[PDB]
Write a protein that holds these residues in place. Sequence first.
Motif, PDB file in Angstrom:
ATOM      1  N   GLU A  88      -8.652 -25.860 -42.247  1.00  0.00           N
ATOM      2  CA  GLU A  88      -8.210 -24.507 -41.802  1.00  0.00           C
ATOM      3  C   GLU A  88      -9.370 -23.459 -42.501  1.00  0.00           C
ATOM      4  O   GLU A  88      -9.309 -22.250 -42.075  1.00  0.00           O
ATOM      5  CB  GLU A  88      -7.023 -24.220 -42.532  1.00  0.00           C
ATOM      6  CG  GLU A  88      -5.630 -24.985 -41.857  1.00  0.00           C
ATOM      7  CD  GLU A  88      -5.424 -24.688 -40.387  1.00  0.00           C
ATOM      8  OE1 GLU A  88      -6.109 -23.377 -39.940  1.00  0.00           O
ATOM      9  OE2 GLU A  88      -4.592 -24.997 -39.638  1.00  0.00           O
ATOM     10  N   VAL A  91     -11.567 -20.177 -40.571  1.00  0.00           N
ATOM     11  CA  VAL A  91     -10.942 -20.216 -39.250  1.00  0.00           C
ATOM     12  C   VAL A  91     -10.343 -18.572 -38.896  1.00  0.00           C
ATOM     13  O   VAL A  91      -9.993 -18.162 -37.832  1.00  0.00           O
ATOM     14  CB  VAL A  91     -10.016 -21.282 -38.943  1.00  0.00           C
ATOM     15  CG1 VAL A  91      -8.575 -20.794 -39.523  1.00  0.00           C
ATOM     16  CG2 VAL A  91      -9.774 -21.702 -37.422  1.00  0.00           C
ATOM     17  N   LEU A  92     -10.433 -17.872 -40.017  1.00  0.00           N
ATOM     18  CA  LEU A  92      -9.571 -16.432 -39.875  1.00  0.00           C
ATOM     19  C   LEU A  92     -10.462 -15.640 -39.135  1.00  0.00           C
ATOM     20  O   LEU A  92     -11.769 -15.801 -39.023  1.00  0.00           O
ATOM     21  CB  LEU A  92      -9.273 -15.844 -41.263  1.00  0.00           C
ATOM     22  CG  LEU A  92      -8.329 -17.032 -41.914  1.00  0.00           C
ATOM     23  CD1 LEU A  92      -8.046 -16.497 -43.399  1.00  0.00           C
ATOM     24  CD2 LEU A  92      -7.004 -17.281 -41.406  1.00  0.00           C
ATOM     25  N   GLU A 353      -4.132 -17.652 -32.124  1.00  0.00           N
ATOM     26  CA  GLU A 353      -4.336 -16.580 -33.319  1.00  0.00           C
ATOM     27  C   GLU A 353      -3.374 -16.785 -34.412  1.00  0.00           C
ATOM     28  O   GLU A 353      -3.420 -16.056 -35.397  1.00  0.00           O
ATOM     29  CB  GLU A 353      -4.058 -15.422 -32.589  1.00  0.00           C
ATOM     30  CG  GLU A 353      -5.140 -15.266 -31.418  1.00  0.00           C
ATOM     31  CD  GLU A 353      -5.042 -13.628 -30.779  1.00  0.00           C
ATOM     32  OE1 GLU A 353      -3.723 -12.639 -31.068  1.00  0.00           O
ATOM     33  OE2 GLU A 353      -5.521 -13.166 -29.998  1.00  0.00           O
ATOM     34  N   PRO A 355      -2.453 -18.362 -37.817  1.00  0.00           N
ATOM     35  CA  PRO A 355      -2.766 -19.010 -38.940  1.00  0.00           C
ATOM     36  C   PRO A 355      -1.616 -20.000 -39.727  1.00  0.00           C
ATOM     37  O   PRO A 355      -0.386 -20.126 -39.284  1.00  0.00           O
ATOM     38  CB  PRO A 355      -3.261 -17.784 -39.921  1.00  0.00           C
ATOM     39  CG  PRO A 355      -2.156 -16.610 -39.752  1.00  0.00           C
ATOM     40  CD  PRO A 355      -1.972 -16.714 -38.166  1.00  0.00           C
ATOM     41  N   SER A 356      -2.390 -20.582 -40.449  1.00  0.00           N
ATOM     42  CA  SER A 356      -1.538 -21.826 -41.137  1.00  0.00           C
ATOM     43  C   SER A 356      -0.656 -21.426 -42.254  1.00  0.00           C
ATOM     44  O   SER A 356       0.176 -21.876 -42.755  1.00  0.00           O
ATOM     45  CB  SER A 356      -2.315 -22.912 -41.440  1.00  0.00           C
ATOM     46  OG  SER A 356      -3.060 -22.462 -42.688  1.00  0.00           O
ATOM     47  N   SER A 404      -5.305 -12.403 -38.950  1.00  0.00           N
ATOM     48  CA  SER A 404      -5.329 -13.376 -37.943  1.00  0.00           C
ATOM     49  C   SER A 404      -6.133 -14.570 -37.716  1.00  0.00           C
ATOM     50  O   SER A 404      -7.231 -14.471 -38.318  1.00  0.00           O
ATOM     51  CB  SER A 404      -5.382 -12.687 -36.219  1.00  0.00           C
ATOM     52  OG  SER A 404      -3.876 -11.903 -36.051  1.00  0.00           O
ATOM     53  N   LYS A 405      -6.012 -15.710 -37.383  1.00  0.00           N
ATOM     54  CA  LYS A 405      -6.847 -16.678 -36.897  1.00  0.00           C
ATOM     55  C   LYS A 405      -7.445 -16.207 -35.647  1.00  0.00           C
ATOM     56  O   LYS A 405      -6.900 -15.495 -34.754  1.00  0.00           O
ATOM     57  CB  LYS A 405      -5.768 -18.254 -36.927  1.00  0.00           C
ATOM     58  CG  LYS A 405      -6.630 -19.119 -36.071  1.00  0.00           C
ATOM     59  CD  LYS A 405      -5.923 -20.399 -35.505  1.00  0.00           C
ATOM     60  CE  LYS A 405      -6.871 -21.445 -34.875  1.00  0.00           C
ATOM     61  NZ  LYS A 405      -7.618 -20.960 -33.933  1.00  0.00           N
ATOM     62  N   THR A 414      -3.477 -24.487 -34.703  1.00  0.00           N
ATOM     63  CA  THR A 414      -2.936 -24.945 -36.369  1.00  0.00           C
ATOM     64  C   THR A 414      -1.896 -26.077 -36.070  1.00  0.00           C
ATOM     65  O   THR A 414      -0.987 -25.863 -35.217  1.00  0.00           O
ATOM     66  CB  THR A 414      -2.491 -24.003 -37.119  1.00  0.00           C
ATOM     67  OG1 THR A 414      -2.479 -24.791 -38.364  1.00  0.00           O
ATOM     68  CG2 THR A 414      -1.321 -23.213 -36.739  1.00  0.00           C
TER      69      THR A 414
END
Length: 595
Positions: A88, A91-92, A353, A355-356, A404-405, A414
């Motif tokens: 992860e 990845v943002l 988009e 995120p984890s 956001s991712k 994710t």
Amino acid sequence: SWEVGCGAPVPLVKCDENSPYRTITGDCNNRRSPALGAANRALARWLPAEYEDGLALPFGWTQRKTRNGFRVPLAREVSNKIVGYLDEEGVLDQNRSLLFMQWGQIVDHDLDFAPETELGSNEHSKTQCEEYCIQGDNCFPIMFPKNDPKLKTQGKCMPFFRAGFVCPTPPYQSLAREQINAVTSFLDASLVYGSEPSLASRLRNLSSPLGLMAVNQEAWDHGLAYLPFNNKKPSPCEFINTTARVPCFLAGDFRASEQILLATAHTLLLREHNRLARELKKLNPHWNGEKLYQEARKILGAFIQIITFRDYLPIVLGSEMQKWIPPYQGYNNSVDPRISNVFTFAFRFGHMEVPSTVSRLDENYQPWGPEAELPLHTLFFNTWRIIKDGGIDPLVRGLLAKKSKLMNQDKMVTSELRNKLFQPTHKIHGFDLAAINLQRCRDHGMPGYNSWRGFCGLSQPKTLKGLQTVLKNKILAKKLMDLYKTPDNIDIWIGGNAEPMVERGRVGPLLACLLGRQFQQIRDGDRFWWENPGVFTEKQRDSLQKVSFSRLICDNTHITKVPLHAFQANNYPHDFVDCSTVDKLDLSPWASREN
Ligand code: HEM
Ligand SMILES: *[C@@H]1O[C@H](CO)[C@@H](O[C@@H]2O[C@H](CO)[C@@H](O)[C@H](O)[C@H]2NC(C)=O)[C@H](O)[C@H]1NC(C)=O
Ligand SMILES: *[C@@H]1O[C@H](CO)[C@@H](O)[C@H](O)[C@H]1NC(C)=O
Ligand SMILES: *[C@@H]1O[C@H](CO)[C@@H](O)[C@H](O)[C@H]1NC(C)=O
Ligand SMILES: *[C@@H]1O[C@H](CO)[C@@H](O)[C@H](O)[C@H]1NC(C)=O
Ligand SMILES: [Ca+2]
């Protein structure tokens, strides 16, 4: 010839052929053809449906039967080989806030919902599908490939039920299967107020005649309102934590508690409804309940439309914005404003988009306790973390200050969504939203990647090298060709999302076209669009153009620090201003000049 025959399932009503306001159903919007855009009708078909048998059976149904001479790959195999990733870190998105993701899910729930074939509860078929993974009728299970770790852990398949379809839902007519949009095609806050009179009534508070909406009961947010708990059982928001037994919230859309940040946005919107009403009463003490309801509802609808087309779409479409959504020149009654079947897949770009994690932040935008940051999967159907763990202000600050991712061709979805999704009927956090998306594309009879490229006037690659050139990614093109064998066969969801993003935007060319076209249509073909002459006054519009997501926050939370531009990345504190900085909505043009 031509016929608008089939589709009797009857939200059929009489058209108050002017009336000031929208119906709840969206009936009557268009005068000539008054069902256009209404809830509970067939999604529009921009291209004809592509089923295995011409009529209803999805590609993938029958082992023997190829698409274009090749077997379509298992959805879960595409998910494993292309969509998944482990790490992860990095990845943002460096210029989109988490609000950017969240607002997209809001706008999507306003526009389209295609619920599954229910066949009610008390059903042996649901056992037969899950328990045994036997394909038949509306059970179209997602089979794990050989090598899938979920094989070891979970069983043979993930359950999946085919979407409902118009005329009948059980035995089907002839001519190709058309899936239902359960909500209104207009951008009209139907996620707040409902798309059916029934639900739209439960939502209203009909005791005190101040045009208000029903609010919570047991729970209070440091003096501010929560949405009401939902009646029905079994409730997944109790199932996730049986010791806290907080149920889901009730809202104008079914899925409102699906994740805690969606809940959180629904709270902002409800609070704003009541603030509008309460103050519209002050100015106009001689306006009765309904009048306060419909005038608030009307302002909120404008707000959703304004945030969307002025702040949101520019940074999705970027450079393609003005190619697909030209300047507004007014209402065109000949514009089809129904949401297309394809749009309901294109708008799933959102999934890449997410995120984890989700964070709760305090007044200084520092971590809200020891467990401040949580994994997304713990937050599906989670209402209690709002009640116990300190309300929505800590979450709203996360929506403002976190990211956001970023869509990434090597890190698409994710594992919080791709491996640990929770589904209400079922008991585990063990499902795959990517797999579901691909299986659903097929469910809905989607044409392949190349038909859509053609539709949008883009090149249709036929070789490995053509695909590599379009995607600008050799390894990705190669994995796509190894699974699908021809780009003709690539599911639109994964096809669209695999393209590199347009300059200044967050989607590639195909998606920008599919999305841009659809948003154009719902603006142009909406008689209640906020900028159509006479919908609001000159002075009303001038006041509306001042609204901002930052102003909404200020007024509906205990946060006094917000950024001026809520959707881009905003670091505390350089980008944050005092709430007194922000323009407030001046309601003094809604004073009635009756006399
Ligand atoms: C934690 C975040 C999210 C979760 C858990 C979530 C989950 C889901 C689930 C379970 C479905 C139903 C899938 C099916 O059976 O076919 C769905 C559909 C959809 N989602 Fe998401 N989603 C998320 C974020 C987004 C975002 C950010 C957008 C857009 C910006 C988005 C757009 C849609 C659309 C357009 C559909 C199809 C709705 C319809 O039925 O017409 N979602 N999502
Ligand atoms: C509907 O709004 C009214 C008016 O604010 C609320 O009625 C109140 O109900 C509570 C329950 O104890 C008390 O404050 C009074 O009985 C009422 N207050 C007033 C000002 O009339 C009511 O809570 C709202 N209904 C729902 C479902 O939220
Ligand atoms: C972020 O996007 C905004 C949208 O208004 C744009 O104007 C700005 O140049 C971008 N900021 C950065 C850091 O690129
Ligand atoms: C359930 O909620 C209680 C508080 O009501 C909390 O202490 C507990 O950790 C929660 N457990 C889970 C699994 O969410
Ligand atoms: C409205 O749109 C249609 C089809 O897109 C177009 O042909 C027509 O000229 C437009 N109507 C008016 C009044 O311009
Ligand atoms: Ca709507």
